[PDB]
Design a protein around this ligand. Structure first.
Ligand SMILES: Cc1cc(CNS(=O)(=O)c2cccc(N/C=C3\CCOC3=O)c2)nc(N)n1
Ligand SMILES: Cc1cc(CNS(=O)(=O)c2cccc(N/C=C3\CCOC3=O)c2)nc(N)n1
Lengths: 207, 207
């Protein structure tokens, strides 16, 4: 188990998300489904020239899994996934994101719902989650589990409990007052409202 | 000069953009600036682990150049740029884009302004330009000029007259009735409305 400190600006962004009273929090689903869709476009494209890239699963889709017993909402995709390096870079540092631009925009009156246009929509998960676990498997690496309850640090460790072929699973450990996002009606309404045009199947699992 | 045929779907997409009646054409500027911004994020990020990546130019910015004499509007950035292969593949085919989903979205009520969400915002240039020329220089290749007036084909040839160091320049050869986008007041208005939060300087050249 390795522990890392988020780059300062990312930590700052995360605190802002957790401490703000933004009302339209439902957009966290749109942002994660968007990320999944983009990850799916990637593997789809690479497979165009390297058919073997799909030996780890040819099906390209997105699964939404609510569990009221564990109070978690999980977003799963069979996209390109992330290597260990990808996890530490894409999720722990500004990297290619517009973190700085986004934080400055918020000070200038920008809206939180625009978070996705700055390449940091993942973090909106903290609008409704106290902790986020990310399990991912990329064709070029082994399976890994990333995790953070904010506070400035995150952990990464190899995940061997149950192989997933290829993709990313974002597990949202919901805040006590955000359980509405586990209700079928609520989830369906959100998907129809913000992700109706996604070019991949989105299946809502029944509990 | 090499002449290529667009992938069928891409030709179909450009056709939908050129023939559909849609008055809110101003979004083309937001889409091009967004591409420039993302291309800057990419070189900014790569330069983190490899400072030499900026030997071809450390300044990261976007320039908007109007010319009423040549009836052109040029969007230039000092982003990562595109290799020859990148031009042919990224502008000539679906690649990792959401071309398929966008065309389906349009037939399902989606709006053309939503084009950028599907990774094909570049083609919105055709909302106002009869011809588009793309001059680009990537660190790992020579300078090339891509060009198309739609019609199902595009050309690529080496460019030399004037080296740019690194980046991309999108030259919009405007349609006779779209000269408003050459007016300083019009451009300033569009930038404030759709690109006020970009994290890179956007300089509007004076005529
Ligand atoms: C984060 C992430 C990464 C990937 C696979 N990698 S990708 O290159 O295809 C990919 C696909 C879509 C988004 C990202 N990066 C997003 C970020 C970075 C920080 O905050 C964000 O929102 C990466 N899939 C999924 N579902 N989520
Ligand atoms: C198209 C393009 C590409 C790049 C440099 N490459 S990038 O990987 O950093 C890059 C940055 C932003 C967007 C893209 N691809 C966009 C596309 C493809 C089909 O239609 C679109 O809209 C590529 N810079 C600029 N200014 N424009």
């Amino acid at each position: 188990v390795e522990t890392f400190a988020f780059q300062a600006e990312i930590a700052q962004l995360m605190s802002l998300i957790i401490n703000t009273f933004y009302s339209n929090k439902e957009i966290f689903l749109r942002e994660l489904i968007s990320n999944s869709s983009d990850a799916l476009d990637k593997i789809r494209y690479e497979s165009l020239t390297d058919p073997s890239k799909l030996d780890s699963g040819k099906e390209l889709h997105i699964n939404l899994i609510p569990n009221k017993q564990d109070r978690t909402l999980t977003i799963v995709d069979t996209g390109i996934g992330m290597t260990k390096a990808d996890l530490i870079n894409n999720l722990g540092t500004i990297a290619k994101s517009g973190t700085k631009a986004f934080m400055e925009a918020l000070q200038a009156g920008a809206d939180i719902s625009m978070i996705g246009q700055f390449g940091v929509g993942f973090y909106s998960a903290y609008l409704v989650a106290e902790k986020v676990t990310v399990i991912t498997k990329h064709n070029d690496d082994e399976q890994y589990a990333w995790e953070s309850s904010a506070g400035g640090s995150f952990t990464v460790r190899t995940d061997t409990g149950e192989p997933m072929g290829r993709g990313t699973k974002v597990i949202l450990h919901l805040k006590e007052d955000q359980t509405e996002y586990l209700e079928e009606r609520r989830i369906k309404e959100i998907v129809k409202k913000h992700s109706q045009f996604i070019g991949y199947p989105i299946t809502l699992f029944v509990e």
